[PDB]
Amino acid sequence: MNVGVNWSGQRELPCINQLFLTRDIDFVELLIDNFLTTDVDSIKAFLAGRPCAFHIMNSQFLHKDERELLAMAKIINKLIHSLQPIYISDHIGKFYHRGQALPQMLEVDYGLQTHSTIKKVKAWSSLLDGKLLLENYPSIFPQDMSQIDFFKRILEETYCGLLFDISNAFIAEVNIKQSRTSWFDLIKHCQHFHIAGFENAPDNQFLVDTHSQCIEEPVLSFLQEVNNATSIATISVERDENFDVSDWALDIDNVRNRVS
Amino acid sequence: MKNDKKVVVKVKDKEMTCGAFN
Amino acid sequence: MEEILDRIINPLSAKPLTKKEHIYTSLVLQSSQSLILSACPSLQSQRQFCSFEYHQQFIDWCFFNKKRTDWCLALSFYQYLSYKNEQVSVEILKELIHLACSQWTYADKSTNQTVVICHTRLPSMVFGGNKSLFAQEFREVFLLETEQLKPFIQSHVPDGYFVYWILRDDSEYPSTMGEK
Ligand SMILES: [Fe+3]
Ligand SMILES: [Fe+3]
Ligand SMILES: [Fe+3]
């Protein structure tokens, strides 16, 4: 099991540099669409031999036709060729409503025009050099179609795979009572994972997928269930706020200890 | 640009991240 | 639901929401207000601009007038302040342009490295942003004092409008008409 971390920008670099000096970081997951004009050698210098993986935040590919994506695919594919990521991955997310840009990525309506969404998945993934993995959303509200049934169709009808976020699935269980159980059929064909912390919304109305706290015990016990169910090739221990090296290192330690 | 008389300023914001806001 | 989505872009409806739905829509809306407030300390000179209800009024106005709420949000906010107040300090205008240039470097997903922004109120100032070009280097938000675009902005930009250009890099001034 290669245990890694996410890297989206420069705010966290002091903290990552400290992690590099006090822990084994087996790989780094770049939020690659934040590095599209970055000198590739400068990226390699920072990685200092560590392998990388790609995670795409803002392709917004469900809002676009295939032709609008060509330019972004070209840049990403050059970065894929030069950096050779272990995997590449994107999100199932909603970024606009009635033409207004949202301040956050919201959950997709899985059952609405499911076939058109599967077609956009095929189109985007066919333009990227490699098998595209799609990450499960930390559901806040229930809807008619299960996220599981949605991903079952992705995995059956397209060339895409699953990037399974363990704490996102835990968040959905709390928020919408989606039994974690339902993912285990798909989990068994997944080898690349995420795990992170979260926070309570005001008045504890739902869990927010902040990547800002340490991983809590129920999520680690979910991790061990995942480890029993499948082969964990890689897991990225995510952090996007509160760049305290001791807390991130504690998360990395707990993830490794839990599967030993 | 050609009036290289420039000032760089700080902006307290942040890159796109997967972490939701709270 | 589409009602939850509707209240995120059009918050001033009185259509009822449950507590959970209301706290979510408020949370999502709070994120864009925080971005503005954290990056523009000069707004504290006018505390009325800083209330969450003022933010909600701003977002609602953006819905009715289809103003952009992406990286151009800060520019939209200046236009709302102009629309509502008789005057706004140039330091608020400047900080909001700086915020927009910053947000451009995070949102634009092309090989272009540079955005340049100007406003009719400051015809002798050119604002810009450069994406990070090296792994450990921050994005660069800059300001130029220059008359280079002043003739173009008085003849081709109506008062109250911003104009912006996307450029491959920051070596040359914009030649063309930009947007707005
Ligand atoms: Fe994740
Ligand atoms: Fe997450
Ligand atoms: Fe993600």
Author numbering:
A (entry chain A): 1 to 260
B (entry chain F): 1 to 22
C (entry chain D): 1 to 180
Question: What's in the article?
Answer:
To understand the mechanism of how MbnBCs catalyze modification of MbnAs, we finally solved the crystal structures of VcMbnABC and RrMbnABC at resolutions of 2.2 Å and 2.7 Å, respectively. In VcMbnA, the C-terminal half of the LP (residues 13–16) and the CP (residues 17–23) form a curved structure that docks into the catalytic cavity. This presents the only cysteine residue (Cys18) of VcMbnA at the apex of the curve, coordinating with one of the iron ions in the catalytic cavity formed by VcMbnBC. The divalent ion (Fe1) coordinates to VcMbnAC18 in VcMbnABC and to RrMbnAC25 in RrMbnABC, providing direct evidence for cysteine modifications of MbnA by MbnBC. In VcMbnB, the residues coordinating the iron ions are His55, His91, Glu135, Asp165, Asn168, His194, Asp209, and Glu238; this is also the case for equivalent residues in RrMbnB. Glu135 in VcMbnB provides a bidentate carboxylate ligand that bridges Fe1 and Fe2. The L2 loop of VcMbnB harbors the conserved residues Asp209 and His211, which are critical for Fe3 coordination. The main chain of VcMbnB Asp240 forms an intramolecular hydrogen bond with VcMbnBH211, while the side chain forms a hydrogen bond with the amide nitrogen of VcMbnAG19. Mutation of VcMbnBD240 to Ala, Glu or Asn had no detectable effect on VcMbnB’s interaction with VcMbnC but slightly impaired VcMbnA recognition by VcMbnBC. However, the mutation abrogated enzymatic activity of the VcMbnBC complex.
Methanobactins (Mbns) are a family of copper-binding peptides involved in copper uptake by methanotrophs, and are potential therapeutic agents for treating diseases characterized by disordered copper accumulation. Mbns are produced via modification of MbnA precursor peptides at cysteine residues catalyzed by the core biosynthetic machinery containing MbnB, an iron-dependent enzyme, and MbnC. Here, we present crystal structures of MbnABC complexes from two distinct species, revealing that the leader peptide of the substrate MbnA binds MbnC for recruitment of the MbnBC holoenzyme, while the core peptide of MbnA resides in the catalytic cavity created by the MbnB–MbnC interaction which harbors a unique tri-iron cluster. In both structures, the interactions between MbnA, MbnB and MbnC result in the formation of a 1:1:1 tertiary complex, and the overall structures of VcMbnABC and RrMbnABC are nearly identical.
